[PDB]
Amino acid sequence: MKIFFITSNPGKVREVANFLGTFGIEIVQLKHEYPEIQAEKLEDVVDFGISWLKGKVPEPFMIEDSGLFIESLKGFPGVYSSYVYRTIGLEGILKLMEGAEDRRAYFKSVIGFYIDGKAYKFSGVTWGRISNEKRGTHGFGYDPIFIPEGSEKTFAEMTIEEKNALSHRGKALKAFFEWLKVNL
Amino acid sequence: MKIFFITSNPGKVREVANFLGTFGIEIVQLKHEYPEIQAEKLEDVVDFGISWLKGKVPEPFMIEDSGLFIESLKGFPGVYSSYVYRTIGLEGILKLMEGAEDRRAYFKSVIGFYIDGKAYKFSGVTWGRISNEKRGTHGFGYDPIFIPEGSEKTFAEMTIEEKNALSHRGKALKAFFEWLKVNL
């Protein structure tokens, strides 16, 4: 089955296509820019996005929003993870986190899927901590400073299959795949 | 199958017994006090607890820790939810949350299970927001000031079966039940 994934993030592209790939699902990366609202929650942004790509994109379609939520920083950068990454970078988070007693954080991914006059949401969350220094050469964004719970390596020290086994995006994709086999 | 649940929380007792009940699992509430460490994470407390109830309690056994983590309060009261509830109460949280732009919070439950020279952990999380006033007559603890995402009612406006369908504890119990059918 084919799914059109509206995104300009190539790191997301690969994670999604490869995972859903090995069950025979072809993921097709369309680049149609859509509006991401400011909101307290990722799902709010996804809802708005699907509603807007109504009848401008081939169906079935999916979109995704994700973020790193840092406990001692009251959820920052959260919904604005992409912006904060490109402005202040990995060094900015590490500077903010210097001397922190609490380095806990989570990644959250929310997938929106549209098919048959209807939208469905799936989500995934991985808990962890912010590393004391950047490590690793894979992945994208905050991957080099996030170590998920139970692991010693950062997200960026792992391969796509390895991240997908542990990551927020992997879990939302799982929840999504579970719904798909039950509804198609 | 019988499971010995070491706890003095009768609200937890009922939720757990009833849910696992309807699949023919008899949950037995033993009261053996054990030590809960201060820790950044619920799972840390559970691990320590199981390790300590080693060979003092009949097997198989389970224990649970849970907490309400309030975003704008940097995860408070979190691991210390039970203490904070009995000291400052529902009124204390509401006072702390007055004028808050961000009322987001989550409940997390972690179940520890011991059987066959081995411990296993399961967890569940429900996202939501702190209500502006207390509502409802069911449940325990912060139930009257927590509204889970997608709902209009607080945890305390719902029945046990209704909370179990939506709650953190219900989700950990589900994850636990899924593991049980696969391993017994």
Swiss-Prot record, chains A, B:
Molecular function terms from GO: dITP diphosphatase activity; ITP diphosphatase activity; metal ion binding; nucleotide binding; ribonucleoside triphosphate phosphatase activity; XTP diphosphatase activity
Reaction(s) catalysed by this chain's protein: XTP + H2O = XMP + diphosphate + H(+); dITP + H2O = dIMP + diphosphate + H(+); ITP + H2O = IMP + diphosphate + H(+)
Cofactor(s) required for function per UniProt: Mg(2+); Mn(2+)
Pfam families named in the record: Ham1p_like
Highest taxon listed in the record's lineage: Archaea
Residues holding Mg(2+): E36, D65
Active site as annotated: D65
Entry-linked SUPFAM superfamilies: ITPase-like
EC number: 3.6.1.66
Annotated Gene Ontology cellular component terms: cytoplasm
Signal peptide residues on this chain, from the entry's feature table: none
A single BP term in Gene Ontology: nucleotide metabolic process
Annotated InterPro entries: dITP/XTP_pyrophosphatase, ITPase-like_fam, RdgB/HAM1
Bound cofactor: record note: Binds 1 divalent metal cation per subunit; can use either Mg(2+) or Mn(2+).
Family to which this protein belongs: Belongs to the HAM1 NTPase family.
PANTHER family in the cross-refs: INOSINE TRIPHOSPHATE PYROPHOSPHATASE (PTHR11067:SF9), INOSINE TRIPHOSPHATE PYROPHOSPHATASE/HAM1 PROTEIN (PTHR11067)
Name the UniProt record assigns to this protein: dITP/XTP pyrophosphatase
